[PDB]
Amino acid sequence: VRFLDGHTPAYDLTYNDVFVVPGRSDVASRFDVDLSTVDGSGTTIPVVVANMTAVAGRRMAETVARRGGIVVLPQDLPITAVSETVDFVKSRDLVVDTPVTLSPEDSVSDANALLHKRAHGAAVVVFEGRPIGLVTEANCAGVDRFARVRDIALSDFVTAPVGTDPREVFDLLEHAPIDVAVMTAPDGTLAGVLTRTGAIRAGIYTPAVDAKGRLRIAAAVGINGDVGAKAQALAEAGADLLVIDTAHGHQAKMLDAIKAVASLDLGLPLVAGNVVSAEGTRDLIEAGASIVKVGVGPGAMCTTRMMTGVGRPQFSAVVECAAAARQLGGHVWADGGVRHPRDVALALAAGASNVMIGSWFAGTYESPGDLLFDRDDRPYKESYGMASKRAVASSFDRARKGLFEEGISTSRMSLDPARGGVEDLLDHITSGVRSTCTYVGAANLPELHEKVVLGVQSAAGFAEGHP
Amino acid sequence: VRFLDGHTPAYDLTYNDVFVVPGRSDVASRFDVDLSTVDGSGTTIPVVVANMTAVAGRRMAETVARRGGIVVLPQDLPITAVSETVDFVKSRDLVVDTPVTLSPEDSVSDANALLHKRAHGAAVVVFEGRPIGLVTEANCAGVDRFARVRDIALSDFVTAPVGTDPREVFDLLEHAPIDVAVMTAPDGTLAGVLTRTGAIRAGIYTPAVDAKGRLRIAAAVGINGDVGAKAQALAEAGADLLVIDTAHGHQAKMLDAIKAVASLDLGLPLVAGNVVSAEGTRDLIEAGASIVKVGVGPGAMCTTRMMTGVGRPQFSAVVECAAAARQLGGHVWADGGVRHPRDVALALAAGASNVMIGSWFAGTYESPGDLLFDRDDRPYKESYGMASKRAVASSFDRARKGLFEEGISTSRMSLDPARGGVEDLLDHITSGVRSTCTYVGAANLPELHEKVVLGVQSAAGFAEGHP
Amino acid sequence: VRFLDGHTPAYDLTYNDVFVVPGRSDVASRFDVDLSTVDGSGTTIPVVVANMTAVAGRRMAETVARRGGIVVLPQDLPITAVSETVDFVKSRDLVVDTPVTLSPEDSVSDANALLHKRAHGAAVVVFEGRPIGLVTEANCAGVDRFARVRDIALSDFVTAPVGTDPREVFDLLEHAPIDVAVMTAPDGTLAGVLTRTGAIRAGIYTPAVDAKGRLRIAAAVGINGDVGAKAQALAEAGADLLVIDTAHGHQAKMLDAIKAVASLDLGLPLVAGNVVSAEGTRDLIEAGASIVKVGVGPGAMCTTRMMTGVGRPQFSAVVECAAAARQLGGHVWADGGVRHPRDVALALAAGASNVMIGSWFAGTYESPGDLLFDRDDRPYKESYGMASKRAVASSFDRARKGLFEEGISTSRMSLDPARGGVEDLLDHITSGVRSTCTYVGAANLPELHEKVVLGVQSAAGFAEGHP
Ligand SMILES: Nc1nc2c(ncn2[C@@H]2O[C@H](COP(=O)(O)O)[C@@H](O)[C@H]2O)c(=O)[nH]1
Ligand SMILES: Nc1nc2c(ncn2[C@@H]2O[C@H](COP(=O)(O)O)[C@@H](O)[C@H]2O)c(=O)[nH]1
Numbered sequence A, B, C: 001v002r003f004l005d006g007h008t009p010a011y012d013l014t015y016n017d018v019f020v021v022p023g024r025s026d027v028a029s030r031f032d033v034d035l036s037t038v039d040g041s042g043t044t045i046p047v048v049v050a051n052m053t054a055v056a057g058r059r060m061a062e063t064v065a066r067r068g069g070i071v072v073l074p075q076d077l078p079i080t081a082v083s084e085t086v087d088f089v090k091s092r093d094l095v096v097d098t099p100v101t102l103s104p105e106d107s108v109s110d111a112n113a114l115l116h117k118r119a120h121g122a123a124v125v126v127f128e129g130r131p132i133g134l135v136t137e138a139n140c141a142g143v144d145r146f147a148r149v150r151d152i153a154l155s156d157f158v159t160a161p162v163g164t165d166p167r168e169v170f171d172l173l174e175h176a177p178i179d180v181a182v183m184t185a186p187d188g189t190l191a192g193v194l195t196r197t198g199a200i201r202a203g204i205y206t207p208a209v210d211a212k213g214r215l216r217i218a219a220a221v222g223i224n225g226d227v228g229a230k231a232q233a234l235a236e237a238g239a240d241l242l243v244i245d246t247a248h249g250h251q252a253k254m255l256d257a258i259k260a261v262a263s264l265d266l267g268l269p270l271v272a273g274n275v276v277s278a279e280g281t282r283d284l285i286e287a288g289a290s291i292v293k294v295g296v297g298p299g300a301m302c303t304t305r306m307m308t309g310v311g312r313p314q315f316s317a318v319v320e321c322a323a324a325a326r327q328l329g330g331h332v333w334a335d336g337g338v339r340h341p342r343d344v345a346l347a348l349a350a351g352a353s354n355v356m357i358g359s360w361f362a363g364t365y366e367s368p369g370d371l372l373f374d375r376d377d378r379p380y381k382e383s384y385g386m387a388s389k390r391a392v393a394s395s396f397d398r399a400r401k402g403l404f405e406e407g408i409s410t411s412r413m414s415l416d417p418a419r420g421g422v423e424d425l426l427d428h429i430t431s432g433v434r435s436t437c438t439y440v441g442a443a444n445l446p447e448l449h450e451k452v453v454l455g456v457q458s459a460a461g462f463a464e465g466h467p
């Protein structure tokens, strides 16, 4: 990667340690650059939700797939649930988001708890397949918590048939007091709910789809047990992308698993990780892997840095591994150490074809967790690490193995009081990345990597700018 | 008044010191009792807003008059403003509330500041006399504060012609996401805005009107200066009720002013105060006064208790003065010491034909004050005493008089975060009074006075019940 | 009632205002006095759980019935649920408490939430009707929240057949690390769980049973609607005691309802309330009521004192009504104003044949509510008032009635960090009452009423003693 004159430090670079120098730009606006990835995962944005049991669910899968990003299902899940989630995701409209369907016999407490499942801010009360009312935080408040939803003072909704251009739903909702609108099928049955900002995003973002035009989905597999059989079964379950994840991706078990999956000839791209060394990436590439995940330790849920001292500054690892993979022709997605959109922008700047966010999406409306409330009423959610789920494995043996196993770390990921949904944070990330391209002056991600000028940044440098 | 057996205390009774014992009741529901007053002020509810410069304005005047209560304009106001307010109030629809009219050239900051002028929670953007949009706290937030209101994302409103029964506006607004509705004149021009709870109140409350069917209004006059000329001028200005208010209503100046106003033969009922003694009430009645205001010191803005030790427990004073006036045939409105609806209920229980609330309405949306915000974002407003305005009066003389004048007391009257409007607190007061009648078993206020059973209550007794 | 020489106040007496002077005693120990009630409700202790939707459930019903107290089911409940609760209560062992039955397929989160349903502190994992393990707060902590209960490290339990005397289960559990013990049926199926303190209470308390030896239960009915049909249906549902409750028990609707129920000849004792006057009690007695509930306003969830000023100090009302009822031969249970066991002791001292606790049991493990946790981890629960459920009653009519309806008051009732169960607080109340009898020197409640010496107590007097 390009480096500024006189910048020869005797130290590695992390996201906390780097900045990009803007260059001569010909890109007029941020909308003139495309974020389509070259890695072959078929995501139009370089954002993938990590394989978290607390952050990767069907709601995030469908939402991010409609927004143009891949979602990797967490490992150690019964294949029945995997198939159910895949079928649910593949049966989603390409433009309209699936709302919170509410049966008339649901309680007010259940409706209130379900209202925060999505970022729309409203849930649809549907009877016999036809939407009959709308609920929100306003009408729900004050009424008895275990009363039925049939007397929650259903509000009026803007009804339009499926197929209208986003312009029509937008200006129809220009003066609507409620941001959401019920997208209705031609027969009158409810097909989904589309929002004002959703209408805006329908043109900016192009959903990531497979050859059959269905929302792409991914899943993660470990190394313990028969990796080949599990990978083949998940591939038949409908997963578009297969990911092999482990705490240490440079062990011989990783190489054996990658070799087995490559020999399976499943046809899906191969994803392995994580390694923070160039030699590990070359070994994984030679083992039959197309994609190499990088980063062990910088992960916000990773504890091994404090317990063992292992790890690496993320930015130097990602740039070195990306250079090695491009020398071997492979492609790399950065994983770990992501807390701000600048982290994502630098991760693509280092050369990564795609990015792995991780625990940041734990603070979303659609994450598969419980939105509990603190004293200050600030919404937030708890992010968990997998620990043994990314580690290679009788009651005696189980307890003996678990004694030395690192505990499941817990953090309080705060929700934005206004922009709490995954949609607007994704918008922020995409806007930051587009601004990075405009400052560099690149029309696409490969040009962003080629034409970037990269500097080293210290701790005192972050005092510059608004936090 | 009726007193419980064995209750012969050697001490006076205040609102803090009394309770009412329920008796045999024949009134089925609270809606079966009428709150029409006998005092002749023509108010269908026993609530009058005090003569506060910070609490008595045109908005409170019109709102409370439409709700069935009289409003007394504060003294020491230029008669031009008095006439303007009277003309504004007399030109108000009997059912629909006047909204916050917003010209399209107003700024976002002005719109936000005006939105809290009324309890509707929304303001009407009106162009060429026709309403074109609706604004609220939702669309106003986020947009630039000094941007025009023409790009504040006006919302849709429910439009109905003037004359529809409250049932029609109610069920038309049953499923409306916005509580307010634009009441439009037959020609298409805006006539007012009516709310869901306003539609509910349109049947429960009957507005207080004069012989010409216009919202009744009242004004206050002092004793300093020519009382007769000022009273005659305000009567010609359109004030329905004339009130003579002073700190001490038992002085000879009060008697002279009452005699002059009675000799004026203005035709309006005579109101004088305040006296906390029976002999003062008899003197005021003999001076030519029909109504005697009672209470000096219990007022939440009154300071004379702490400065001089003067005053009286309110409840004993009001009951004694009401008994004296009924013996002389006069009628009395209790003034001061009102903080809870139980205070109002006891004030009517003592025998008062009407009640004076005072500083409690300072914590309202419609009060003529500035709604400032604290750290906890709790809305509140400051209540001021008149001081010298209720006291009998060169730079030397002015400063010499002002040195000994009691300072303008200031208090922080908190707004209810949900029920901040004057409408819902008035509803609470009326519900409490109706519950008092139902517990007593009285069909009207005279029966409430006649059939009430009254007990004495100590400090430890208030620990009973939910605060 | 007996009154101390020179005690002729001109003021009523509440629980905050009274104390009992100990007299010449012949009762050696507290265990030598019996708390059997004379009112005919058949409760061996003078404690009844109020008709609260948040405090009266099947768990409280069975627990308090086994402890010797009646439980009144709240009104406005579908008779199907009433019949289900009655059948559940009547099918409870006379000595052993019903534990928290846990299926092996339950999650750790569900087990943790259910563990606080009872005061035992442990839940039984039962498979095919046979208990296979024990869970508590210790083994549940640390393990994954959505893991199955089959791998929660089930502990060992003390197994005994049903029929062993409490001595045997006590000394068998003398050195048991776990207080609870699984009471097993002779065939091996689980019949219940009995605790060490439960074994202790099995001799002190005698469960309240009907003629068929089944745990007695009670239910509450309002006055709106057909009172006779509802009362007859609940009587056929299996309710032992019928209670007619309303906000104002002196209205003509109350008299009509009592007359109808008395004419029904249902055979159950008649309970009506609440009235705080002797004349109301006489009217209710003449209407065909055997029991008169007393107290409106002192209730910790009652708001009418602050809204309307109505009410009465509880102690004077209860003593006067008890004297009137005993003159007419009727019996009275005090209701409202109960926060300490001294309140109960004085309520029986005033002459009440039984006591109504109310919101105090809202802070229990077995109350039908959600045990949420604060920052200080102190357990507590929210107590609600019925409001309109104790008041006499289209969308327009519904909303119009609800506008004037008093809001559902909410309070934070703190749980004792150690003695959080209903069992130990009931023990405290019974110990206080027994101590009161010992200080008076009475062998039973009628002797307690007859031989009591009663004094008046001020606010400064409560500073005596440990709070
Ligand atoms: N009634 C209802 N429940 C829903 C809906 N969407 C999600 N849920 C609830 O959420 C569960 C799945 O949570 P998730 O894995 O999507 O975060 C479902 O099993 C169901 O309980 C909906 O539209 N309606
Ligand atoms: N060793 C280890 N790595 C973890 C754990 N939880 C998450 N990670 C890693 O950290 C990444 C997420 O971190 P983030 O990108 O949110 O900072 C995951 O995708 C995974 O690679 C854990 O418990 N142990």
Ligand SMILES: Nc1nc2c(ncn2[C@@H]2O[C@H](COP(=O)(O)O)[C@@H](O)[C@H]2O)c(=O)[nH]1
Binding pocket: B057, B058, B059, B099, B100, B101, B102, B103, B114, B117, B367, B368, B369
């Ligand atoms: N533009 C506008 N200002 C209003 C409206 N109602 C009240 N105001 C503002 O409030 C002032 C009077 O305040 P008030 O005495 O009613 O509390 C007016 O002079 C004006 O500045 C309205 O409908 N539109």
Ligand SMILES: Nc1nc2c(ncn2[C@@H]2O[C@H](COP(=O)(O)O)[C@@H](O)[C@H]2O)c(=O)[nH]1
Binding pocket: B050, B051, B247, B274, B295, B297, B298, B299, B300, B301, B302, B303, B304, B335, B336, B337, B338, B356, B357, B358, B359, B360, B384, B385, B386, B387, B390, B408, B409
């Ligand atoms: N002496 C005196 N009385 C006041 C003052 N401000 C208000 N009051 C009295 O107190 C009443 C309002 O008190 P409130 O009814 O709110 O407790 C007024 O109507 C007036 O009679 C003041 O500054 N001085």
Ligand SMILES: Nc1nc2c(ncn2[C@@H]2O[C@H](COP(=O)(O)O)[C@@H](O)[C@H]2O)c(=O)[nH]1
Binding pocket: C057, C058, C059, C099, C100, C101, C102, C103, C114, C117, C367, C368, C369
């Ligand atoms: N699995 C299980 N749930 C119980 C048990 N006891 C109570 N519950 C739960 O508590 C509900 C009733 O709550 P309650 O009305 O008893 O407070 C039941 O419907 C069930 O969900 C028990 O022994 N086992």
Ligand SMILES: Nc1nc2c(ncn2[C@@H]2O[C@H](COP(=O)(O)O)[C@@H](O)[C@H]2O)c(=O)[nH]1
Binding pocket: C050, C051, C247, C274, C295, C297, C298, C299, C300, C301, C302, C303, C304, C335, C336, C337, C338, C356, C357, C358, C359, C360, C384, C385, C386, C387, C390, C408, C409
């Ligand atoms: N008027 C009224 N009384 C209530 C309300 N909630 C409870 N109560 C009364 O207060 C009693 C409980 O009060 P406690 O005995 O807990 O102080 C109830 O049994 C009932 O008589 C309410 O919302 N309104």
